[PDB]
Amino acid sequence: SASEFDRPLRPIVVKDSEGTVSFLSDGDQSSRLLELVKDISSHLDVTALCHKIFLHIHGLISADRYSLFLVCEDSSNDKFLISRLFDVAEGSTLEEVSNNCIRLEWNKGIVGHVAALGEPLNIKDAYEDPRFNAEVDQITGYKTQSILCMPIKNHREEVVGVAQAINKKSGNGGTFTEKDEKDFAAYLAFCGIVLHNAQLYETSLLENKRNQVLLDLASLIFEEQQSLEVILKKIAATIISFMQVQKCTIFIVDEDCSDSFSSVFHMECEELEKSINYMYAQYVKNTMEPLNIPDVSKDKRFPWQCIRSLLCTPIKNGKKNKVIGVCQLVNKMEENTGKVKPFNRNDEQFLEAFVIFCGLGIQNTQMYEAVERAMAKR
Amino acid sequence: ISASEFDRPLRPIVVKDSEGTVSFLSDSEKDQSSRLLELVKDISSHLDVTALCHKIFLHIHGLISADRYSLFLVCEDSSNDKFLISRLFDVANNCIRLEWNKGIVGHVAALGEPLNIKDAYEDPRFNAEVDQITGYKTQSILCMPIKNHREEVVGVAQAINKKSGNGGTFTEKDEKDFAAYLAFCGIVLHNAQLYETSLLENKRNQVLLDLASLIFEEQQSLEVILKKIAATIISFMQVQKCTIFIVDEDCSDSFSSVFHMECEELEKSYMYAQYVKNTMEPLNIPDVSKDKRFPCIRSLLCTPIKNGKKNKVIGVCQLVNKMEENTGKVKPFNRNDEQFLEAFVIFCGLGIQNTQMYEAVERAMAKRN
């Protein structure tokens, strides 16, 4: 389902030349340093690679608590760091990676900001920092003294990661060295590269999986193109499922009266599945392009549980001109919340590809029902 | 766009499940001590295998000092038969290709040990045909293996003929400097390959995705549709003849009838099918004239078009003479070639199947008229 696909990926489908539409795209530290870079260099797996980095910074330079952060980016290009790899309280755990996951939005927090500016930070007293949040420090009676918080960038200087060290170990009540930066920041510069390769590889693995899904759904709907009702159910069921939405509603442009709608098929997302607000359908037919509305109680186009976010595409046929039906998704839901987000590019992008086959299939189902209506004229 | 640009090892194109149903969800998935680093830094950014090679090529230049330099990339086809290829080769266009244990290099490949060669005209493995034709004298030779981290050999690089005052061998300490840098190339090389295989696994999904939009466009005639099918299969797979057999609708060990296209276009309308029909499984005959048949038709792929629930055999697909491009030369089928057809057959299944049902009403209506 659609929500592990929610970083930025390439289009599923591609136009060319009044785009006919297609799928097919186109000394003895220096010494040590090395031994390390070898050790990461072989990891393409971000989880795996992240662990190995976290491990590495540890004996990289001397302090009390370390933290790694990984930049992320949903499909709407909104970014943010998360970390499950967090030094805590010292002999004291449910589990390690404790089911449990920090997440800073972009530019908030000491790290937030390191990120968003991509310059390192060598604080001597955290409490002097206006972006230190002392809530944790307070509740657990740790004393956060000194902070090393450096960005990790890929070769193009993009920030992919932040990593910081807290409270330099010391028996002279000390700070983080100029040297101390360097060693830490050297080793990171390698990470930013290796890591970035890791992200790009995992994007393709995903980019794949998405297409495998698409192929499976392709086979599914195509199995039984003999009853409109039959086939819409599978389109409807299959979508509500993968898209995590609340309703789906297919409208079939009528084959004779090329204006209005002969059949209509609805489906709520606790499964029931049977046969009254045509405004968006008629728009998207007459407009012939998709409709994405983050929420309708704020869209000046359409006289205003209930219908917040709308992503409503049109099904064209073969030869790619007549809109033959329309598809109206309603109310994407944040995964396990049930909150209600707006459809982002992902969802737009999958649907677009999906209804190409939705088209083909509905069109040929209709053919069948056609011939069947011939036979019952004698 | 040819089956043949996908001829390396890939994930299973389909998983079949406890009981019939093939899915596409596959792979269960979501000092120069300091001077070296400058070098490692520079390659590690690269996931393009070309671009990463060109880079390794340069580095090795500044790394040991020798007259002619070359770097060799291991390769691999659906069938797991490794060669080496190379387009970076000081002769100080064209692309070398060595089979697996041939040559010096192909030997250091296959043994993945280095050869440090003091005079070349002594090593058995050497041959002077080329020195001779061209007037070079090969002399000393450092040939080193490039391993990724699991110690497997992904490439070979070599340096021929030291530059010296005293006339030089290749130093106990040149070997090291080299092997060294080569360790890193191993690992980066490997990932870059890994990346591209992925990239390739996805271009595959879009070939299918495409050549399914193609099929299910109109399913209103068994004649139309098999043309569309065969036509594409022939170009895609690079064979001379597609023959689609459709099992008798009615009952059952017959063959209703039969499209057959060869590879220029349209004129249409005989054992081999049979065997698949009955077995229910793909058939791979390298040489068609050395099996269980008695006999052009040198090479045979026959795949069974199954059906809805994937337990009956709707139909059968067969092709003749896989012929590598750059040639025309005929040639057997391999895992790639099976796999793509294994997939393309599914949709073909539903494709056909669904057209059948339509004609089953064209033919209900030819009982009146």
From Swiss-Prot, chain A:
Domain of life: Eukaryota
Tissues and organs where the protein is expressed, per its UniProt entry: Expressed in aortic smooth muscle cells, heart, placenta, skeletal muscle and pancreas and, to a much lesser extent, in brain, liver and lung.
Domain GAF: from-to ranges: 45-195, 227-362
TM regions (residue ranges): none
Residue numbers of Phosphoserine PTMs: 1
Processing and modification events after translation: Phosphorylation is regulated by binding of cGMP to the two allosteric sites. Phosphorylation by PRKG1 leads to its activation.
Role summary: Plays a role in signal transduction by regulating the intracellular concentration of cyclic nucleotides. This phosphodiesterase catalyzes the specific hydrolysis of cGMP to 5'-GMP. Specifically regulates nitric-oxide-generated cGMP.
Assigned protein family: Belongs to the cyclic nucleotide phosphodiesterase family.
Domain notes: Composed of a C-terminal catalytic domain containing two putative divalent metal sites and an N-terminal regulatory domain which contains two homologous allosteric cGMP-binding regions, A and B.
Name of protein: cGMP-specific 3',5'-cyclic phosphodiesterase
Species per Swiss-Prot/TrEMBL record: Homo sapiens
Residues of the full protein shown: 102 to 518 of 875
